[PDB]
Amino acid sequence: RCPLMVKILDAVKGTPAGSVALKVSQKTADGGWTQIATGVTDATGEIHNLITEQQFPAGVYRVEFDTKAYWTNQGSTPFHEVAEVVFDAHPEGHGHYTLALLLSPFSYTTTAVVSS
Amino acid sequence: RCPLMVKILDAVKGTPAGSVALKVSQKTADGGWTQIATGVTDATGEIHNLITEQQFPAGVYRVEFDTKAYWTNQGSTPFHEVAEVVFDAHPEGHGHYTLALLLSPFSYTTTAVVSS
Amino acid sequence: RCPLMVKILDAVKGTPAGSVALKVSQKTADGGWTQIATGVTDATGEIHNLITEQQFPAGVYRVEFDTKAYWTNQGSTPFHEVAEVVFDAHPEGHGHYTLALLLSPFSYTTTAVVSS
Amino acid sequence: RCPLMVKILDAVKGTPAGSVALKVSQKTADGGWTQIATGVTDATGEIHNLITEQQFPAGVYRVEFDTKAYWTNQGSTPFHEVAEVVFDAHPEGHGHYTLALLLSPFSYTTTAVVSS
């Protein structure tokens, strides 16, 4: 029932990516951003209770994943400064969002699963 | 504690890929393949109790996903005939294997998550 | 001898992604961004002469790809608003960058090829 | 006018994947396979003139990429035994193919670019 979920995997080690820091922001009508939550994945590459339903109204959201610190801690030199995922939420109605992210030092894949 | 799991996602639809048929085969002594299980993904893109521990000793395995029929039914003409994932497994001591698979008509991404 | 190249592919059609608009920006001292180039991919999914040697000093760069319009114009309703790639660029020795991007309605893969 | 090209990239180092051995087979009328070419990528992750026009009729093809040895040659331990890409070719006609392959030790992405 958590409206926004993440699932982060490490494609080098074949494990989830633990202790990846992230920030969730909401777009403002002027095109700026307001931070609504921060979090850190657990050893399963997930975050519980990131945000509540009330904090998640329809609109455009940005999730910034601090992948550079993840790789630096892993002993690898990464390419990207950050990984940002930007999307409109609820352009139709309700439902829950899971942002899947697969990380390599010089690449990432991101997909969404949108369900109800 | 399912020794072999799958998680299939649809990158066009933004949902798990349900009703994907697959076959699990085990490499034999003379280098052939024997089929040891079949299944179809559920609506969460998974197959529960695909094989038992007793059916899964150390060895080389092949999991064949029938992605072409998945796309043909969806109405998209796909590039690949099948998606095959081949790997050496050593499950003894509860090492669990999850094969993740992200599908598009002309591309797939596949990753493994191996427990410790 | 283009310091910065892109290669965008469409994973639904199995063709390069033509007509994708993009913006190249450089991080400024005050932490802001200054746009240094814009373009639209050709039918090979590339943009030649995106920027010159002289406009590519060391520093942080952002390339924003307008993937939403790409999909909506192909008649698909996508997940992401945009796809952003942010990286610190170096090459002291004529080192060049290729940003590869593989697009599906609800997913993208981005990788970098850095020469040397 | 190579009807079949490949492009293999390394997602750990950010370079093309050099010296990857591969084997190309064609599906026979009976459901078997016949080998029609072998090669090794150059440092650009390509193989020039893998096969001729005359060797590439419409039909089902398999490319077996020896990713396991790629990774051990890089000094890493990989998950997959091989990466097989099986696809249907240009019954109508004409059409040329590029198989793109992005490699990480525990993951790969396979896509195709099919151009007239």
Coordinates of C-alpha atoms in Angstrom, one line a residue:
Chain A
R1 CA 0.0 0.0 0.0
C2 CA 3.0 2.3 -0.1
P3 CA 2.3 4.7 -2.9
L4 CA 5.9 5.0 -4.0
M5 CA 8.4 2.1 -3.8
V6 CA 11.9 1.5 -5.2
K7 CA 13.8 -1.7 -6.1
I8 CA 17.5 -1.2 -6.7
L9 CA 19.8 -4.0 -8.0
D10 CA 23.6 -4.2 -8.4
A11 CA 24.4 -5.8 -11.8
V12 CA 28.1 -6.3 -10.9
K13 CA 27.6 -8.3 -7.7
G14 CA 24.2 -9.9 -8.3
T15 CA 22.6 -8.5 -5.2
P16 CA 20.2 -5.7 -4.3
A17 CA 21.9 -2.3 -3.8
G18 CA 22.0 -1.5 -0.1
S19 CA 22.2 1.9 1.5
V20 CA 21.6 3.9 -1.6
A21 CA 20.5 7.4 -0.5
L22 CA 17.6 9.1 -2.4
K23 CA 15.5 12.3 -2.4
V24 CA 11.9 12.6 -3.5
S25 CA 10.8 16.0 -4.9
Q26 CA 7.5 17.5 -6.3
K27 CA 7.5 19.9 -9.2
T28 CA 6.2 23.4 -8.4
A29 CA 4.0 25.3 -10.9
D30 CA 7.0 27.6 -11.7
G31 CA 9.0 24.6 -12.7
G32 CA 11.0 24.5 -9.4
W33 CA 11.2 21.6 -7.0
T34 CA 10.1 21.0 -3.4
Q35 CA 11.6 18.1 -1.4
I36 CA 9.0 15.9 0.2
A37 CA 11.1 13.0 1.5
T38 CA 14.5 11.5 1.9
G39 CA 15.4 7.8 2.3
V40 CA 18.1 5.1 2.3
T41 CA 17.6 1.7 0.8
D42 CA 17.9 -1.4 3.0
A43 CA 19.8 -4.5 2.0
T44 CA 16.9 -5.6 -0.2
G45 CA 17.3 -2.4 -2.2
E46 CA 13.9 -1.1 -1.0
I47 CA 12.6 1.7 1.2
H48 CA 9.6 1.3 3.5
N49 CA 7.2 4.1 4.3
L50 CA 9.0 6.6 2.0
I51 CA 5.9 8.8 1.7
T52 CA 2.2 8.6 2.7
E53 CA -0.7 8.8 0.3
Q54 CA -1.5 12.4 1.4
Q55 CA 2.0 13.5 0.5
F56 CA 1.6 12.0 -3.0
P57 CA -1.1 14.0 -4.9
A58 CA -1.1 14.0 -8.7
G59 CA 1.8 15.9 -10.2
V60 CA 5.3 15.6 -11.5
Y61 CA 7.9 13.9 -9.2
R62 CA 11.6 13.5 -9.3
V63 CA 13.5 10.8 -7.5
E64 CA 17.3 11.5 -7.3
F65 CA 19.4 8.4 -6.5
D66 CA 22.9 9.0 -5.2
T67 CA 24.5 6.3 -7.3
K68 CA 27.9 8.0 -7.4
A69 CA 28.3 7.6 -3.6
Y70 CA 27.1 4.0 -3.9
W71 CA 29.8 3.1 -6.4
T72 CA 32.5 5.1 -4.7
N73 CA 31.8 3.1 -1.5
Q74 CA 31.9 -0.1 -3.5
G75 CA 35.4 0.6 -4.7
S76 CA 34.4 1.5 -8.3
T77 CA 34.6 4.6 -10.3
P78 CA 31.3 5.5 -11.7
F79 CA 30.3 7.6 -14.8
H80 CA 27.1 9.3 -13.6
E81 CA 27.0 12.1 -11.1
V82 CA 23.5 11.0 -10.1
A83 CA 20.5 9.0 -11.5
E84 CA 17.3 11.0 -11.7
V85 CA 13.9 9.6 -12.6
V86 CA 11.2 12.1 -13.4
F87 CA 7.6 11.2 -14.0
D88 CA 3.9 12.4 -13.9
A89 CA 2.0 10.6 -11.1
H90 CA -1.7 10.0 -11.4
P91 CA -2.4 11.4 -14.8
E92 CA -5.4 9.1 -14.9
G93 CA -6.2 8.2 -11.3
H94 CA -4.8 6.4 -8.3
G95 CA -2.4 3.4 -8.1
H96 CA 1.0 2.6 -6.7
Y97 CA 4.4 3.2 -8.3
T98 CA 7.5 1.1 -8.1
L99 CA 10.8 2.5 -9.6
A100 CA 13.1 -0.3 -10.5
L101 CA 16.8 0.6 -11.0
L102 CA 19.6 -1.7 -12.2
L103 CA 23.0 -0.2 -11.6
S104 CA 26.4 -0.7 -13.3
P105 CA 29.4 1.7 -12.9
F106 CA 28.9 3.1 -16.4
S107 CA 25.2 2.3 -17.0
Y108 CA 21.8 2.2 -15.4
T109 CA 18.4 0.8 -16.5
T110 CA 15.2 2.2 -15.0
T111 CA 11.7 0.9 -15.4
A112 CA 8.4 1.6 -13.7
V113 CA 5.7 -0.7 -12.5
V114 CA 2.3 1.1 -12.1
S115 CA -0.4 -1.0 -10.4
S116 CA -3.5 -0.9 -8.3
Chain B
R1 CA 12.6 -20.4 0.2
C2 CA 12.1 -21.1 -3.5
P3 CA 15.4 -22.1 -5.0
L4 CA 14.7 -20.7 -8.4
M5 CA 12.5 -17.7 -8.9
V6 CA 11.7 -15.3 -11.9
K7 CA 10.5 -11.8 -12.1
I8 CA 9.3 -10.6 -15.5
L9 CA 8.4 -7.0 -16.3
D10 CA 6.9 -5.4 -19.4
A11 CA 8.6 -2.2 -20.4
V12 CA 5.9 -1.1 -22.8
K13 CA 2.9 -1.5 -20.4
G14 CA 4.7 -0.7 -17.1
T15 CA 3.4 -3.8 -15.4
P16 CA 4.6 -7.4 -14.6
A17 CA 4.5 -9.7 -17.7
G18 CA 1.8 -12.2 -17.0
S19 CA 1.1 -15.5 -18.8
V20 CA 4.7 -15.9 -20.1
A21 CA 5.4 -19.6 -20.6
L22 CA 8.8 -20.9 -19.6
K23 CA 10.8 -24.2 -19.4
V24 CA 13.6 -25.1 -17.0
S25 CA 16.2 -27.6 -18.2
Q26 CA 19.2 -29.3 -16.6
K27 CA 22.4 -30.1 -18.4
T28 CA 23.1 -33.9 -18.5
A29 CA 26.2 -35.9 -18.4
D30 CA 26.6 -36.1 -22.2
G31 CA 26.0 -32.4 -22.7
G32 CA 22.3 -32.6 -23.6
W33 CA 19.4 -30.9 -21.8
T34 CA 16.6 -32.5 -19.9
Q35 CA 13.5 -30.5 -19.1
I36 CA 12.7 -30.6 -15.4
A37 CA 9.8 -28.0 -15.1
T38 CA 7.4 -25.8 -17.0
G39 CA 5.2 -22.9 -15.9
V40 CA 3.4 -19.7 -16.9
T41 CA 4.0 -16.5 -15.0
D42 CA 1.1 -15.1 -12.9
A43 CA 0.0 -11.5 -12.9
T44 CA 2.9 -10.5 -10.7
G45 CA 5.4 -11.8 -13.3
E46 CA 6.4 -14.7 -11.1
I47 CA 6.0 -18.5 -10.8
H48 CA 5.7 -19.9 -7.3
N49 CA 7.0 -23.4 -6.5
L50 CA 8.7 -23.7 -9.9
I51 CA 11.0 -26.4 -8.7
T52 CA 11.8 -28.0 -5.4
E53 CA 15.1 -28.2 -3.6
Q54 CA 15.3 -31.9 -4.4
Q55 CA 14.9 -31.1 -8.1
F56 CA 17.7 -28.5 -8.0
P57 CA 21.2 -30.0 -7.4
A58 CA 24.3 -28.2 -8.5
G59 CA 24.8 -28.1 -12.3
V60 CA 24.2 -26.0 -15.4
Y61 CA 20.7 -24.8 -16.0
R62 CA 18.8 -23.3 -18.9
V63 CA 15.6 -21.3 -18.4
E64 CA 13.8 -20.6 -21.7
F65 CA 11.2 -17.8 -21.8
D66 CA 8.7 -17.8 -24.7
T67 CA 8.7 -14.1 -25.2
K68 CA 7.7 -14.3 -28.9
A69 CA 4.2 -15.6 -28.0
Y70 CA 3.9 -12.9 -25.3
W71 CA 4.4 -10.2 -27.9
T72 CA 2.5 -11.8 -30.7
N73 CA -0.5 -11.9 -28.4
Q74 CA -0.1 -8.3 -27.2
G75 CA -0.1 -7.3 -30.9
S76 CA 3.5 -6.3 -31.3
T77 CA 5.9 -8.2 -33.7
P78 CA 8.9 -9.0 -31.7
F79 CA 12.6 -9.5 -32.7
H80 CA 13.6 -12.5 -30.6
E81 CA 12.4 -16.0 -31.0
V82 CA 12.9 -16.7 -27.2
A83 CA 14.9 -15.5 -24.3
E84 CA 17.3 -18.1 -22.8
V85 CA 19.2 -17.7 -19.6
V86 CA 22.0 -20.2 -19.0
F87 CA 24.0 -20.4 -15.7
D88 CA 25.9 -22.7 -13.3
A89 CA 24.1 -23.1 -10.0
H90 CA 25.4 -24.2 -6.6
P91 CA 22.3 -24.1 -4.4
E92 CA 23.7 -26.2 -1.6
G93 CA 23.5 -24.3 1.7
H94 CA 20.4 -22.3 0.7
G95 CA 21.8 -20.3 -2.2
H96 CA 18.7 -19.0 -3.9
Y97 CA 18.5 -17.7 -7.5
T98 CA 16.2 -15.0 -8.9
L99 CA 16.3 -14.3 -12.7
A100 CA 14.9 -10.9 -13.5
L101 CA 13.8 -10.1 -17.1
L102 CA 12.6 -6.8 -18.6
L103 CA 10.9 -7.2 -22.0
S104 CA 10.4 -4.9 -24.9
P105 CA 9.5 -6.1 -28.5
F106 CA 13.0 -5.6 -29.8
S107 CA 15.1 -5.8 -26.5
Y108 CA 15.3 -7.6 -23.2
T109 CA 17.4 -7.0 -20.1
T110 CA 18.2 -9.9 -17.8
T111 CA 19.9 -9.8 -14.4
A112 CA 20.4 -12.3 -11.6
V113 CA 20.1 -11.9 -7.9
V114 CA 21.9 -14.6 -5.9
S115 CA 21.4 -14.9 -2.2
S116 CA 24.0 -15.7 0.5
Chain C
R1 CA 36.2 14.4 -33.8
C2 CA 33.0 15.3 -31.8
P3 CA 33.7 15.4 -28.1
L4 CA 30.1 14.6 -27.3
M5 CA 27.9 12.2 -29.2
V6 CA 24.6 10.5 -28.7
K7 CA 23.1 7.2 -30.0
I8 CA 19.4 6.8 -29.2
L9 CA 17.5 3.5 -30.0
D10 CA 13.8 2.6 -30.0
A11 CA 13.2 -0.8 -28.3
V12 CA 9.7 -1.1 -29.6
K13 CA 10.3 -0.6 -33.3
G14 CA 13.9 -1.8 -33.4
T15 CA 15.2 1.3 -35.2
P16 CA 17.2 4.4 -34.1
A17 CA 15.0 7.0 -32.4
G18 CA 14.8 9.9 -34.8
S19 CA 13.4 13.4 -34.0
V20 CA 14.3 13.3 -30.3
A21 CA 14.9 16.8 -29.0
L22 CA 17.7 17.3 -26.5
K23 CA 19.5 20.0 -24.5
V24 CA 23.1 20.1 -23.4
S25 CA 23.9 22.2 -20.3
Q26 CA 27.0 22.9 -18.3
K27 CA 27.1 23.4 -14.5
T28 CA 28.0 26.9 -13.5
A29 CA 29.8 28.4 -10.5
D30 CA 26.7 29.3 -8.5
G31 CA 25.5 25.7 -8.9
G32 CA 23.1 26.6 -11.7
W33 CA 23.0 25.4 -15.3
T34 CA 23.8 27.2 -18.5
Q35 CA 22.5 25.7 -21.8
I36 CA 25.3 25.3 -24.3
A37 CA 23.7 23.4 -27.1
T38 CA 20.4 22.0 -28.4
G39 CA 19.5 19.5 -31.1
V40 CA 17.1 17.0 -32.6
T41 CA 18.3 13.5 -33.5
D42 CA 18.5 12.5 -37.2
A43 CA 17.1 9.2 -38.5
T44 CA 20.3 7.4 -37.2
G45 CA 19.4 8.5 -33.7
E46 CA 22.5 10.8 -33.6
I47 CA 23.3 14.5 -33.7
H48 CA 26.5 15.5 -35.5
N49 CA 28.5 18.5 -34.3
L50 CA 26.5 18.8 -31.1
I51 CA 29.2 20.9 -29.5
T52 CA 32.8 21.8 -30.3
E53 CA 36.1 21.1 -28.5
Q54 CA 36.2 24.6 -27.2
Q55 CA 32.8 24.5 -25.6
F56 CA 33.6 21.3 -23.8
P57 CA 36.0 22.1 -20.9
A58 CA 36.2 19.9 -17.8
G59 CA 33.2 20.2 -15.6
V60 CA 29.7 18.7 -14.9
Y61 CA 27.3 18.4 -17.8
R62 CA 23.6 17.5 -18.1
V63 CA 22.0 16.2 -21.3
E64 CA 18.2 16.2 -21.2
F65 CA 16.3 14.1 -23.7
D66 CA 12.7 14.9 -24.4
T67 CA 11.4 11.3 -24.5
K68 CA 7.9 12.1 -23.5
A69 CA 7.2 13.9 -26.8
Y70 CA 9.0 11.1 -28.7
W71 CA 6.6 8.5 -27.4
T72 CA 3.4 10.6 -27.5
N73 CA 4.2 11.4 -31.1
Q74 CA 4.6 7.7 -31.8
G75 CA 1.2 7.3 -30.2
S76 CA 2.3 5.8 -27.0
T77 CA 1.7 7.2 -23.5
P78 CA 5.0 7.0 -21.6
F79 CA 6.0 7.0 -18.0
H80 CA 9.0 9.4 -17.8
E81 CA 8.7 13.2 -18.4
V82 CA 12.3 13.4 -19.6
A83 CA 15.5 11.3 -19.5
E84 CA 18.4 13.1 -17.9
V85 CA 22.1 12.1 -18.0
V86 CA 24.4 13.9 -15.6
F87 CA 28.2 13.4 -15.6
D88 CA 31.6 14.9 -14.9
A89 CA 33.6 15.2 -18.1
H90 CA 37.4 15.2 -18.2
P91 CA 39.5 14.3 -21.2
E92 CA 42.8 16.0 -21.2
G93 CA 43.8 13.8 -24.1
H94 CA 41.2 14.2 -26.8
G95 CA 38.9 11.8 -24.9
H96 CA 35.4 11.8 -26.2
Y97 CA 32.0 10.7 -24.9
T98 CA 29.1 8.8 -26.4
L99 CA 25.8 8.7 -24.5
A100 CA 23.8 5.7 -25.6
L101 CA 20.1 5.6 -24.7
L102 CA 17.7 2.7 -25.3
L103 CA 14.0 3.8 -25.0
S104 CA 10.8 1.9 -24.2
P105 CA 7.5 3.6 -23.0
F106 CA 8.1 2.7 -19.4
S107 CA 11.9 2.2 -19.3
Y108 CA 15.2 3.5 -20.5
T109 CA 18.8 2.2 -20.4
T110 CA 21.6 4.7 -20.6
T111 CA 25.3 3.9 -20.9
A112 CA 28.4 5.8 -21.6
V113 CA 31.3 5.0 -23.9
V114 CA 34.4 7.0 -23.0
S115 CA 37.3 6.7 -25.3
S116 CA 41.1 7.0 -24.5
Chain D
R1 CA 27.2 -4.3 -47.0
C2 CA 27.4 -6.6 -43.9
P3 CA 23.8 -7.9 -43.4
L4 CA 24.7 -8.8 -39.8
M5 CA 26.7 -6.6 -37.4
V6 CA 27.2 -6.6 -33.7
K7 CA 28.1 -3.9 -31.2
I8 CA 29.2 -5.0 -27.7
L9 CA 29.7 -2.6 -24.8
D10 CA 31.2 -3.1 -21.4
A11 CA 29.0 -1.4 -18.7
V12 CA 31.7 -1.7 -16.0
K13 CA 34.5 0.1 -17.8
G14 CA 32.5 2.3 -20.2
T15 CA 34.3 0.9 -23.3
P16 CA 33.4 -1.4 -26.2
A17 CA 33.9 -5.0 -25.3
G18 CA 36.9 -6.3 -27.2
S19 CA 37.9 -9.8 -28.0
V20 CA 34.5 -11.4 -27.4
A21 CA 34.3 -14.6 -29.2
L22 CA 31.0 -15.5 -30.9
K23 CA 29.4 -18.2 -33.1
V24 CA 26.6 -17.6 -35.7
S25 CA 24.2 -20.5 -36.5
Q26 CA 21.2 -20.8 -38.9
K27 CA 18.1 -22.9 -38.0
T28 CA 17.7 -25.9 -40.3
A29 CA 14.4 -27.1 -41.8
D30 CA 14.1 -29.9 -39.2
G31 CA 14.6 -27.6 -36.2
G32 CA 18.4 -28.2 -35.9
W33 CA 21.2 -25.7 -36.2
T34 CA 24.1 -25.3 -38.6
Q35 CA 27.1 -23.1 -37.8
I36 CA 27.8 -20.5 -40.5
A37 CA 30.4 -18.2 -38.9
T38 CA 32.7 -17.6 -36.0
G39 CA 34.5 -14.4 -35.0
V40 CA 36.0 -12.2 -32.3
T41 CA 35.1 -8.6 -31.7
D42 CA 37.8 -6.0 -32.4
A43 CA 38.5 -3.2 -29.8
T44 CA 35.5 -1.3 -31.1
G45 CA 33.3 -4.2 -30.0
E46 CA 32.4 -5.0 -33.7
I47 CA 33.2 -7.7 -36.2
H48 CA 33.7 -6.5 -39.8
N49 CA 32.2 -8.7 -42.5
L50 CA 31.0 -11.4 -40.1
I51 CA 29.1 -13.0 -42.9
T52 CA 28.3 -12.3 -46.6
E53 CA 25.0 -11.4 -48.3
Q54 CA 24.8 -14.9 -49.8
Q55 CA 25.2 -16.5 -46.4
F56 CA 22.3 -14.6 -44.8
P57 CA 18.9 -15.7 -46.3
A58 CA 15.6 -15.1 -44.5
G59 CA 15.4 -17.6 -41.6
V60 CA 15.9 -18.0 -37.8
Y61 CA 19.4 -17.3 -36.5
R62 CA 21.3 -17.8 -33.3
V63 CA 24.4 -15.8 -32.1
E64 CA 26.2 -17.3 -29.1
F65 CA 28.4 -14.7 -27.4
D66 CA 31.1 -16.1 -25.1
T67 CA 30.5 -13.6 -22.4
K68 CA 31.8 -15.9 -19.7
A69 CA 35.3 -15.9 -21.1
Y70 CA 35.0 -12.1 -21.7
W71 CA 34.5 -11.6 -18.0
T72 CA 37.2 -14.0 -16.9
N73 CA 39.5 -12.3 -19.4
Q74 CA 38.7 -9.1 -17.6
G75 CA 39.4 -10.7 -14.2
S76 CA 35.8 -10.9 -13.0
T77 CA 33.5 -13.8 -12.2
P78 CA 30.3 -13.8 -14.3
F79 CA 26.9 -15.3 -13.7
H80 CA 25.9 -16.4 -17.2
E81 CA 27.4 -19.4 -19.0
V82 CA 26.8 -17.7 -22.4
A83 CA 24.6 -15.0 -23.9
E84 CA 22.5 -16.4 -26.7
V85 CA 20.5 -14.2 -29.0
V86 CA 17.9 -16.0 -31.2
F87 CA 15.9 -14.1 -33.8
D88 CA 13.9 -14.2 -37.0
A89 CA 15.5 -12.6 -40.1
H90 CA 14.0 -10.6 -42.9
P91 CA 11.6 -13.0 -44.6
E92 CA 10.1 -10.1 -46.7
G93 CA 13.4 -8.3 -47.4
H94 CA 15.7 -6.7 -47.7
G95 CA 17.0 -5.6 -44.3
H96 CA 20.3 -5.4 -42.4
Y97 CA 20.7 -6.2 -38.7
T98 CA 22.9 -4.9 -35.8
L99 CA 22.8 -6.8 -32.5
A100 CA 23.7 -4.5 -29.6
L101 CA 24.8 -6.2 -26.4
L102 CA 25.6 -4.4 -23.1
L103 CA 27.5 -6.5 -20.6
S104 CA 27.8 -6.5 -16.8
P105 CA 29.1 -9.5 -14.8
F106 CA 25.5 -10.4 -13.6
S107 CA 23.4 -8.8 -16.3
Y108 CA 23.1 -8.1 -20.0
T109 CA 20.8 -6.1 -22.3
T110 CA 20.3 -7.4 -25.9
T111 CA 18.6 -5.1 -28.5
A112 CA 18.5 -5.0 -32.3
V113 CA 18.5 -2.3 -34.9
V114 CA 16.9 -3.5 -38.2
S115 CA 17.3 -1.1 -41.1
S116 CA 16.2 -1.3 -44.8

